[PDB]
Amino acid sequence: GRALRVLVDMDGVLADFEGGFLRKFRARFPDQPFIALEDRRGFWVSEQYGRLRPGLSEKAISIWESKNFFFELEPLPGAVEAVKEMASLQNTDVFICTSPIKMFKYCPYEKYAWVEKYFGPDFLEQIVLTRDKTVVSADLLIDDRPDITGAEPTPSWEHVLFTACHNQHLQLQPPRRRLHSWADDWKAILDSKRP
Numbered sequence: 001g002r003a004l005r006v007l008v009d010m011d012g013v014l015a016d017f018e019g020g021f022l023r024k025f026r027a028r029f030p031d032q033p034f035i036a037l038e039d040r041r042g043f044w045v046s047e048q049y050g051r052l053r054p055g056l057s058e059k060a061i062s063i064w065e066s067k068n069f070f071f072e073l074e075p076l077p078g079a080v081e082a083v084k085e086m087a088s089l090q091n092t093d094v095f096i097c098t099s100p101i102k103m104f105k106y107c108p109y110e111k112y113a114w115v116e117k118y119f120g121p122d123f124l125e126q127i128v129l130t131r132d133k134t135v136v137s138a139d140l141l142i143d144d145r146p147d148i149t150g151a152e153p154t155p156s157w158e159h160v161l162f163t164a165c166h167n168q169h170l171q172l173q174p175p176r177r178r179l180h181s182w183a184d185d186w187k188a189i190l191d192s193k194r195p
């Protein structure tokens with residue numbers, strides 16, 4: 001029968017972008033104020049830093065534009081083990097669906113390298129790098145960004161919101177749902193979309 005197709009985001013879902021950012025920001029800019037993860041609000045880190053002090057948006061951006069930022073992100077707890085299990089399930093196809101930053105010198109390369117490191121060379125064929133996730137067809141999209149838009153007004157996937165510091169207080173419109181962490185019951189979410 002037909003395979004269930006699941007798209008899994010990278011930053012904020014597999015890879016700890018928020019924690020990696022804060023640690024490197026504090027190391028490079030010890031002089032400057034920062035935003036603790038419990039105080040993060042709004043998807044874009046740079047926009048919140050940009051309200052906090054003039055110049056700080058540009059300093060924030062410079063952290064993720066730096067060589068080795070993406071490569072050195074730690075996996076979120078349980079993320080690698082869950083996605084490996086998910087990809088092994090019968091009648092289930094898993095793709096990693098992630099976006100590059102605007103400055104493209106390191107980020108695409110390092111994202112491939114990161115997937116090779118944690119999932120192996122054979123998983124590289126499961127990567128989709130795109131700024132528009134709405135044009136990728138699937139049953140499910142697991143992603144930390146609350147509002148996902150693009151060229152396709154009616155995407156085929158159901159978006160399941162993955163909890164992150166910046167979204168944890170958001171009330172969503174029914175019938176939208178969440179995956180709270182990789183410890184939460186992702187298999188039930190997948191099962192709800194099967195034939």
Ligand SMILES: O=c1ccn([C@@H]2CCC[C@H]2OCP(=O)(O)O)c(=O)[nH]1
Nearest residue numbers: 011043044045046098099100101145
């Ligand atoms: O504040 C930020 C800035 C950038 N990012 C992601 C890192 C790579 C590109 C950007 O992708 C956001 P996506 O299109 O929602 O996957 C974030 O996840 N948060």
Ligand SMILES: [Mg+2]
Nearest residue numbers: 009011012144
């Ligand atoms: Mg994300």
